[PDB]
Amino acid sequence: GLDAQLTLVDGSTDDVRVNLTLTNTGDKPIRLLKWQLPGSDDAPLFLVERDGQPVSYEGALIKRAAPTDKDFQLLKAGQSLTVQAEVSGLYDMSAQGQYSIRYQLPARRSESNAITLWVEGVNDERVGSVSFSGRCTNTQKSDLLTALDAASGISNNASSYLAVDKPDGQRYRSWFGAYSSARWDQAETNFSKIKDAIDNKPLTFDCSCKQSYFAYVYPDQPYKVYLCKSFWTAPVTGSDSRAGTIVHALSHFNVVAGTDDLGYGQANARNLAKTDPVKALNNADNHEYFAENTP
Amino acid sequence: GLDAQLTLVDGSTDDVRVNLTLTNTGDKPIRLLKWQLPGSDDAPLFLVERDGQPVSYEGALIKRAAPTDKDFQLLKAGQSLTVQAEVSGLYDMSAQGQYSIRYQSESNAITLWVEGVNDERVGSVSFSGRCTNTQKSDLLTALDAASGISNNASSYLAVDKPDGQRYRSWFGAYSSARWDQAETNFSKIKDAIDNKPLTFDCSCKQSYFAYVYPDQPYKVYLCKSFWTAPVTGSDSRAGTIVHALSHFNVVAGTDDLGYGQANARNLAKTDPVKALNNADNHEYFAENTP
Numbered sequence: 001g002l003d004a005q006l007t008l009v010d011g012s013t014d015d016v017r018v019n020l021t022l023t024n025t026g027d028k029p030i031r032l033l034k035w036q037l038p039g040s041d042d043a044p045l046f047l048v049e050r051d052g053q054p055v056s057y058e059g060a061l062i063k064r065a066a067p068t069d070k071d072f073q074l075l076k077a078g079q080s081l082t083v084q085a086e087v088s089g090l091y092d093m094s095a096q097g098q099y100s101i102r103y104q105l106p107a108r109r110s111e112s113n114a115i116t117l118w119v120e121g122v123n124d125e126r127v128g129s130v131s132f133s134g135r136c137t138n139t140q141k142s143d144l145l146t147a148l149d150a151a152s153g154i155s156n157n158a159s160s161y162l163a164v165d166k167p168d169g170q171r172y173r174s175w176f177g178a179y180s181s182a183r184w185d186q187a188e189t190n191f192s193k194i195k196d197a198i199d200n201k202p203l204t205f206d207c208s209c210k211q212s213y214f215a216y217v218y219p220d221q222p223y224k225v226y227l228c229k230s231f232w233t234a235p236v237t238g239s240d241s242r243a244g245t246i247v248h249a250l251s252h253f254n255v256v257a258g259t260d261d262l263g264y265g266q267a268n269a270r271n272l273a274k275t276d277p278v279k280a281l282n283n284a285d286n287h288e289y290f291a292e293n294t295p
Numbered sequence: 296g297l298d299a300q301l302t303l304v305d306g307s308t309d310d311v312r313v314n315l316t317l318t319n320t321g322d323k324p325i326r327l328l329k330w331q332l333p334g335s336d337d338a339p340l341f342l343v344e345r346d347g348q349p350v351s352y353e354g355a356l357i358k359r360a361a362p363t364d365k366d367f368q369l370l371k372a373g374q375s376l377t378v379q380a381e382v383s384g385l386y387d388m389s390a391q392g393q394y395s396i397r398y399q400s401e402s403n404a405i406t407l408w409v410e411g412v413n414d415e416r417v418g419s420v421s422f423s424g425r426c427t428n429t430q431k432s433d434l435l436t437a438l439d440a441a442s443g444i445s446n447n448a449s450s451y452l453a454v455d456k457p458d459g460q461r462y463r464s465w466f467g468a469y470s471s472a473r474w475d476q477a478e479t480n481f482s483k484i485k486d487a488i489d490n491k492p493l494t495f496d497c498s499c500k501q502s503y504f505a506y507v508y509p510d511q512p513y514k515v516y517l518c519k520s521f522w523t524a525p526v527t528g529s530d531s532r533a534g535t536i537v538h539a540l541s542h543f544n545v546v547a548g549t550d551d552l553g554y555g556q557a558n559a560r561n562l563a564k565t566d567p568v569k570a571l572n573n574a575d576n577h578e579y580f581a582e583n584t585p
């Protein structure tokens with residue numbers, strides 16, 4: 001028949017990565033339903049419990065047509081398949097406790113052994129709140145909250161600077177260009193609204209984006225930020241940092257500052273401030289670099 | 296040095312398809328940023344107005360790195376490029392009106408009349424993921440078809456029929472506790488259609504019908520097989536909406552245990568309570584299509 005072993009992958013992370021080995025020990029070949037094998041796509045293939053209580057699946061549920069031939073993975077006599085899958089992104093395992101995980105065996109043409117592990121848990125009151133979607137793992141969840149604390153820091157620093165007007169202010173000149181009291185006031189308003197969203201608004205971070213760039217938002221759908229590959233490749237603080245990407249993305253929301261993405265990068269942002277302060281005050285990266293204030 | 300030429304593409308649908316031809320009239324080549332060309336990714340590249348009144352941008356805004364060599368497109372002296380883009384998915388052009396479209400006052404304005412998508416489900420229906428005007432109207436039609444079969448299904452479930460053929464086919468053998476579960480599940484599917492803020496998303500390019508995230512109501516992501524599916528009938532657009540809504544933990548919390556009618560019937564025969572928690576089983580009860 002079908003032989004399965006589920007094991008926990010060791011690592012210095014809060015991630016719950018499991019390893020499955022499926023072997024055909026039988027006399028004949030066997031076909032296994034492909035979307036019932038744990039890969040990178042979303043499927044509720046695990047039974048997860050916290051202190052004996054079931055933990056709800058969060059991934060996508062999909063309407064598909066009845067499985068045809070094409071949908072089945074072949075396992076020949078003696079052949080084995082080995083695949084890894086992360087569990088904390090599909091099931092909410094952020095709260096601390098003793099968790100149990102079994103793999104739902106794929107249909108052919110019943111469960112694996114259980115593994116049990118301690119989750120130290122995301123130690124944070126926000127989980128003014130922070131929510132997650134698009135398979136953010138336990139580690140991504142923590143890294144995000146760490147990034148948000150830093151975003152709050154530079155965001156506060158920005159507001160603090162904008163409190164007292166300074167016509168010859170270098171920092172301001174750099175990212176917003178030629179001074180006027182009205183233009184200064186616009187940047188100040190913008191930044192206390194960003195700060196307020198960081199500290200007092202229901203935030204949603206999404207880890208589903210697999211695009212090369214940093215992040216994206218739908219400006220009329222507060223407050224959901226989609227995190228892409230360059231956000232993870234980004235440093236926590238500094239230029240084009242994780243903290244700064246958060247300032248950038250939040251500024252877009254119409255209930256925050258309603259900024260556009262007229263241009264990208266410090267150079268373009270600087271040119272915009274000299275070229276058209278009005279454009280600069282309405283550009284997300286200009287607000288990011290103002291806050292990041294990295295030499 | 297750059298001549299921006301905008302034109303409307305002729306088509307049978309209420310899709311708003313435009314051609315942008317950019318011609319380098321100068322003597323030197325000019326560098327174009329790829330993201331500044333209307334394409335596949337979302338950027339607010341059009342100034343759109345409805346009979347002179349402004350229209351809202353609906354797309355995504357994206358933090359990209361400073362442009363590298365890969366990000367630029369050289370347009371040599373005398374040469375041109377032509378790009379095509381759909382506008383109604385990116386801007387709210389649902390309301391009736393003559394609309395003006397201008398690539399950004401960089402291009403010439405074009406004018407076109409939109410008949411408009413049925414409003415006043417605007418309980419509501421919102422859109423995301425570049426749903427075009429045609430798609431929006433096809434969706435609202437499908438939803439009204441979903442209301443009818445859900446209403447019909449909820450009317451049938453009001454009075455217990457222990458030998459009821461339709462019930463037996465999809466939910467299996469009768470008990471009053473099992474029947475009540477089905478009635479409850481359909482009362483809440485009906486409620487979603489009638490009284491809840493619905494969102495339909497058109498970005499899914501996968502071969503299947505649809506997906507949802509059970510704890511993110513009430514957002515239904517529509518895929519290729521929805522658009523290939525008939526409005527009503529077996530595995531229809533109406534029944535897909537029924538299937539998807541049922542998944543939400545706040546509606547019915549159904550799983551996807553088996554797909555298709557034979558698999559849905561088989562589940563009903565042997566494991567009625569699991570049938571009473573399978574999305575397709577609810578869909579087929581509603582579609583009720585031999």
Ligand SMILES: [Zn+2]
Pocket residue numbers: 061062063064538539542550551574
């Ligand atoms: Zn489903």
Ligand SMILES: [Zn+2]
Pocket residue numbers: 216248249252260261284356357358359
């Ligand atoms: Zn942006």
